[PDB]
Every structure is written in structure tokens, then in C-alpha cells.
């Protein structure tokens, strides 16, 4: 729907719908569970 996903944590794909608001489609490093996450959690919970 639309040229992106304005739904925070919105299932997305590096080869499909990215994010609207301007989130980053991050997956579980397995090309699966891809979702656009907002900039509400800078850094990376467990740093490394």
C-alpha cells in the first residue's frame, strides 16, 4: 500500500516497500522478519 510503509515496525523488504516516515528496513540478518523500525532506539540495544 503506497510507495512505502508508514506503519512503525512495518514488515518491509530491501527489494519491496521500504518505509514512509523514513524508517530503516532492518531484518534478522536472514532476509526474513524484515520490518521498518523508526528512530526511537538509536545505538543498538546491546551495542555490538
Curated annotation (Swiss-Prot):
Protein's name in the database: Omega-agatoxin-Aa4a
CDD domains per the UniProt record, alphabetical: Spider_toxin
GO cellular component: extracellular region; host cell presynaptic membrane
Keywords: Calcium channel impairing toxin, Disulfide bond, Ion channel impairing toxin, Knottin, Neurotoxin, Presynaptic neurotoxin, Secreted, Toxin, Voltage-gated calcium channel impairing toxin
Matches recorded under Gene3D superfamilies: 4.10.40.10
GO molecular function: calcium channel inhibitor activity; toxin activity
Major subcellular site: secreted
Subcellular location: Secreted
Domain of life: Eukaryota
Chain's role: Omega-agatoxins inhibit neuronal voltage-gated calcium channels. This toxin acts by modifying the gating of the high voltage activated P-type Cav2.1/CACNA1A channel. Is a potent blocker in both insect and mammalian central neurons.
Ribosomal protein as UniProt keyword: no
Additional record remark: This toxin is a diagnostic ligand for P-type channels Ca2.1/CACNA1A in the mammalian brain.
Disulphide linkage map: 4-20, 12-25, 19-36, 27-34
Amino acid at each position: 500500500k503506497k510507495k512505502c510503509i508508514a506503519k512503525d515496525y512495518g514488515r518491509c523488504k530491501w527489494g519491496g516497500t521500504p518505509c514512509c516516515r523514513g524508517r530503516g528496513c532492518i531484518c534478522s540478518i536472514m532476509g526474513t522478519n524484515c520490518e521498518c523500525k523508526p528512530r526511537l532506539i538509536m545505538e543498538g540495544l546491546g551495542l555490538a
